[PDB]
Amino acid sequence: LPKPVQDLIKMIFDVESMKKAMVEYEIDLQKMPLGKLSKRQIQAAYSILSEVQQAVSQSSDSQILDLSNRFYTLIPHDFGMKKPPLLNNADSVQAKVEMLDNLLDIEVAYSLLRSSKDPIDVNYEKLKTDIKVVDRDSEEAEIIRKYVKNTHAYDLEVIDIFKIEREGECQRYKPFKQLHNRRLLWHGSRTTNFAGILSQGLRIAPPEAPVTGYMFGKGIYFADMVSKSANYCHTSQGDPIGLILLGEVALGNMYELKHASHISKLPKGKHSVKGLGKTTPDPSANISLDGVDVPLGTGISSGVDTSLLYNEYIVYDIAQVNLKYLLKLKFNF
């Protein structure tokens, strides 16, 4: 396999990376090693958060205390010399739901890892994804670099562009090509999540995850500006490399919102949410790639009363998404 692909495989299956991510979430690695992370436990933790969600909307200090203790028993944290924080409001529900989302992806990665061939090839094969290097001189790479440059504290450099095709996903997405308003959009995530994302695709938080834990409810989230999505890479000076997806999203009829709304179900006739931002790619410079809009205009004022800085796009059925590209980006601070 081409060197960039080999490097891609190594970095997403990096076990030390998964551990550091967990530590960053204040998880007690000694009390719960990477190897004992389980789907069952994460599912039950989500359910506790849904109990906190319900308690909050009605609730006493002592049932808050017990739910909190139930949560931390299931997912041991290390709070050092601090009292363990109670799960007392929507803020704590969101913070824990986001961490569980990441734990879930880390568990999927480690489960994939569980001398026929190179370890690199074996792990690549576990992803059930065709990954090809996009030639830096292609029209493809040019468009994608423009999309990055134009919709950009850090400044962004594209290191590698990969064309990706997940097994089965073209067929799954195909009927939605009948659906109008298809857009090429950004989805950022932590590097420790991408083994899970390539093997299973982008997924929605489960039924037992609390709906109030997600700004627009439980769906799959995208941006039309790379700097919005770059925030979800959670990169740092100490480690200035992030990964970001380009996906074609069949948006259909957009339910347009100006504030957070914990949607359980779209209004009849709607197929996605668009969160309306203060800033938007200049609509003038949109291009169409076989019926797919690419909003690679530089950011102008949208003229919209909103609390959002950037547009967001959310769909609520997983088949509405087709991953097209994975970019390795350098964050230069």
Partner: protein
């Protein structure tokens, strides 16, 4: 009746596609209008959908009902002709 006719056409197009392609995939029923979506959320209509062989969305990950890949062009055509 408008939702019924939309359903019928969905079944027939899935029949045509499977027959032409030679391999079959699950097909979402994708309502484009509020009224048709309203039909999809109706208990009666859903009961009709289940008898014809249409599967409800998978928990958590899906909202659209699906025409299972197992259904042959013949089964689909029969279901369509039945209402």
């Amino acid at each position: 009746s408008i939702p019924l006719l939309w359903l019928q056409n969905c079944l027939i197009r899935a029949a045509d596609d499977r027959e032409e392609d030679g391999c079959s995939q699950a097909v979402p029923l994708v309502p484009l209008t509020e009224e048709n979506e309203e039909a999809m959320e109706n208990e009666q209509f859903q009961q009709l959908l289940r008898k014809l062989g249409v599967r409800p969305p998978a928990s958590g990950q899906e909202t659209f009902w699906r025409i299972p890949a197992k259904l042959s062009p013949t089964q689909l055509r029969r279901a369509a002709a039945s209402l």
